[PDB]
């Protein structure tokens, strides 16, 4: 009736599971022969011995677990009572229910990638979005600089394991990221850590900006003048599209001279800024000169920018397809491209004095009566000097005698206009007349007067008609009706029938005398 | 003198409050015959009690702890001496002194709300400021989209509690909080976890960006002109205020004109890009032609931007208020808005050629010796055509004879200057006179000349005075004073006294004669 | 043979130093009259003595550990047998090997210090970098506002230490970190903590935004013209350097009048918007009036921004170096800032009609024949009215008749071109002729004509000679060569050798008579 009850059965109260260690806690023996435990383990298909000589500890903590696996774990204790031999058989000696302890795994990562907002100016902050799978309470990461060749590791987060975790302040540059971790355990000093886990390839963080994409829908127009001098007014107007790129930041006009482009490309061009409206204007382009215009897409990025360009498109304002042209405000003096002017405005009356035009050289002057001429307008095209009247007249140069234009019917004259040779009027004639080629002329009325042919004159006119003012050898005839005079010194006579004076001069010529000597009949009449 | 004394007194050596349950440490029993203990706990008004059964276990862990409440816990030990009926009275069992235990709190949250900086330009952290003001130390976040109906909630942060927890790189989005937590104890498998508490109002993240406001105080001005030409600059000013809104970024100035923004409203208008010093310029700005005049305040926000317009103010450029209008430099030929001239700098005597005035219609042409006229200047006002002198005259159409403006007092005529008909100087003189309404006339001298007027002449003068070339019938009275000639075809006679030219050519025509026919008195003498 | 075997040696299963405190896990006693333990400890030169009366306990905690320091701990058991006495000596009291643990330093900061990316615009994350250097689990951290006198202190990271421990969404202003900590032990109640260490200097953070350079290797350049006009356009060029401050945002091209400057500085002044190109354009630039040209590189930051200028340089173009001329189209009326003139195009022959020029006055009009005149091209200068040719002229006010330029040489004169007196044509010339002085005058041919000269006339023809008006009383000489009348009522006669023109006008003067009464020689012929 002598026995050593064996000590009682095992029980495992509570298991806890570290990366290659369980602790394990149990129950308080009897049989005053203990030594220790024996715990079985089952891998699933092989199975392990372990012994913990001494039993003042209270718990166990097995050790070189074999990872990512649930163990089936069998408490037990034995006396000397029963030998190894008989612990290797599991015979007489108590034994545990069973229970099976799982194995945290190590931290997994699953997901590494950089991602912020798409930048659109400044600087913004980069996420760093890591994702980790595992399990564990003191999990650790780190980074490493992938483009030296030396980088001293460097540790960013230290926390429980998520998801995925995300922290930023990261620096854009290379780096790497491996896994670490470790797992608490009741009994203070143990602690239980993680093989290192590199990533297998690294991954850049980089800012979020994108070049953006030119504009399009380039369209043209103009504002045709200003008030007066014909500033031709271009605007530019075009469409910029969103979907892809970064959101564009203001835009650049450069455009340059058609026919300088061909000997410099887009070098010393004309460029000016941009608003955000994309459409800026030029206030006076050039007139027929044509020019090769782009618009260009400017966009900002958190370190530099980088810009995007429309494709060339070059136009040039000509008299097609103005609008908004309602700049034309008359001021008296209209220069324009097509002539230059001076008008005075009156009334409904747009009286125009001064012109000048660049279609047919036309020199206008003064008020027009004329169907298209002026008094002193001119028209050097089939060219003419035309020009009239002169207030002030104290000096010529030549004679201004002749008349042309017309060789024959332009007579070369000076006369009172509306009057001729062969009018009754007292008018006057001077001059070359050409229907006779030769000067007629005519002073005064047509009874008392002098008029004259170019061959032959007619003055039918006396004067007080000879007055005489040297001796006359008469080369002529002396003819007459009547002569009165003082005496008479002659060369040879003739007197047919003597009267005399005592009755000549006396009434009746045949009167008084006292003898008449008629040398006709044999008449010598005495008295 | 045989007893069992009861197992000593019961002590508490440590108190864990989890948040439904509690950890107690206690001491070592004795006495050979105990069974567990029984702990009774005060929740303020009402008792529980509670029964541990086996010893080996060396602390305790009560549950179903009614939540947020203070307990005082009584230690026990209890033997079979005593049985349950003693064990529900305690009389004889020894008991523990009194202690009296907090229950941690659960998680709360006090107060969740999204904040940044004022945005000023570019992408900005949006930071998320929840409160909370619990107790744990392995506190869960989670937040979930509120905007779809189903989102799988996402957990951020991990870790202690705070009084202000804050973390960025959250979306902008819709996003609504929950709030969870655990607390830990010595005995590793045990852990208490806490009830969601999700907050009662979901809150929205957004960036810190505010439209602006419009600029305000618009004030205008303008520098006159250019060197020449009257191009006339346009600058616009205006102050821009802070206090409100965002930062505003640059500007742009539009406008249009006067008389097109009646047509059509703030469409094809003109625009211009402006800088930040809230004042951009036309430099050739339209003259007399009104314009209206908006300045824009353009944001800019992370993902877009944002308008605000100041209200219209339309101005014209007059001739009242101009400054800054020191460029009237004279280049000789000055093209103004008011006249188009040419003159020609010379010491401090600027002397002018060449003008058109946009004012009287004036046109000018040399240099000026009247009060307000020049040799060849004009005036289509009160119509003149001005003119004087002619180097080279070869040609002329009409006469160019006749003198008017003075019907009676300008006499036609073409004469010597100076001198007329009455005048003892040997000038000329010719054409219509009107003081005497027909032409004078005088050549020559005061002695020796011809002289005329419209209805007689008077020639004092000779010639070799009879000149013959016809045979002449004289129709008037041909008188003289003295007669030599060589015959005589007479038709009737006169001889008053016979002298003889034997004596009349000889001296004495009373001289050598021979018989003297006095036919007066009976007179025959006969030598 | 009795005895009291000691119990057995005692060793240390496990040591945990807190700061204050090490928390020392052993084995169990024996001998049945134990009484508590005596831990010996070795601070390096000194040593003291604890008890732990009572022996329920399975663990013990010694407290007021000496900072910083390895301290070696002897365990040991000890009963009633032997007493305090021995218990001082040390002497038949068991006692435990040595073993030394080392105490966890408290966290130190290392260093602490605010840094960014250098900010180009827009709100950007400030980090605060601050090391700590220390060891514990529950490491905190808190911020004070250093600008107010009290600030109640702010926690803002609760976690483990780190060498480097990096957190954002701090405000900018002033704050100072204290570091503080605490120890955790496996006795759940038990927790030590770690006295305040705040930095000895606070620190301020700051975003980086930083003054940029102003713009540099400024350079100027201008495209002459335009189409017509001469509009003059200049363009501004500068180069702009990085390496120090801030990215540079856009520019503002300011600039004022010479002649401006000096009344009053940079108020007022020319300022246009400018791009990202660093070159801006002025399409119509005054000439020959200088100007004072500015470049403002306006930087941007978060809060707001500054400006930083280059010097100012001066420049006006000239007839000196332009560039990109290429806009010399001609339309006919070329309005130039030297010359405004009018010009008609025409193959290979630039016809020009229209001038007037700014270096000479001069006034042109109509096609050019002279060396550098036309016929009514004029010259203010050396004053001269030249014209010529009028096709109508209706009218005069003055005679237009000398003839000046010449006092001498420029006869006064109206007379046909090519004739003069003494030419055999048929021409006619009339006026003041100053060769002789007087008036000169021939009209018609050189036989019949009248001839003319200021003293005397030359009419050598005849009339129908002598045409009578009036009765005359001859003051001359009346001579003649033949005379034949109806009567004659004379005064006193001669007749020498009596015919009669019954012979005279009969054949044969000295025909057919009867008597004939010389008064020579006594001659009484009777028949």
Known sequence: ???????????????????????????????????????????????????????????????????????????????????????????????????????????????????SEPVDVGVGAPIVYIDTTGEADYCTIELKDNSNANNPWVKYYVGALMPTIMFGGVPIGSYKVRISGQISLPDGVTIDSSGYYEYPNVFEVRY????????????????????????????????????????????????????????????????????????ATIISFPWKVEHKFKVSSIAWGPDAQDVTDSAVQTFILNESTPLDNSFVNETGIEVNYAYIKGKIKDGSTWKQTFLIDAATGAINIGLLDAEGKAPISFDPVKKIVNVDGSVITKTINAANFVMTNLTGQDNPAIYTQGKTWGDTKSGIWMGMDNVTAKPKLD??????????????????????????????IVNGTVTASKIVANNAFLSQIGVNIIYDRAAALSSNPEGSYKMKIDLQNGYIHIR
């Open 1 to 115: 009736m002598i026995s050593n009850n064996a000590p009682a059965k095992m029980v495992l109260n509570s298991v806890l599971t570290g990366y290659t260690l369980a602790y394990i806690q149990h129950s308080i023996y009897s049989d005053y022969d203990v030594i220790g435990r024996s715990f079985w383990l089952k891998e699933g298909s092989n199975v392990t011995r372990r012994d913990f000589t001494g039993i003042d500890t209270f718990s166990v903590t097995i050790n070189n677990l074999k990872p990512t696996t649930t163990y089936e774990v069998q408490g037990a204790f034995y006396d000397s009572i029963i030998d190894s031999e008989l612990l290797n058989a599991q015979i007489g000696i108590n034994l545990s229910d069973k229970q099976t302890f799982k194995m945290k795994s190590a931290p997994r990562i699953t997901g590494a990638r950089c991602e």
């Open 208 to 279: 979020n900006f994108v070049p953006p994409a030119a504009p399009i829908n380039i369209v043209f127009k103009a504002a045709r003048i200003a008030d007066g001098k014909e500033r031709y007014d271009l605007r530019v107007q075009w469409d910029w599209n969103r979907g892809a790129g970064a959101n564009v930041r203001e835009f650049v006009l450069s455009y340059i001279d058609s026919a300088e482009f061909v000997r410099t490309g887009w070098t010393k061009a004309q460029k000016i800024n941009v608003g955000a409206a994309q459409s």
């Open 443 to 472: 002073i005064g009325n047509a009874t008392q007067y002098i008029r004259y042919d170019g061959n032959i004159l007619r003055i039918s006119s006396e004067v007080v008609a000879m007055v005489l003012h040297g001796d006359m």
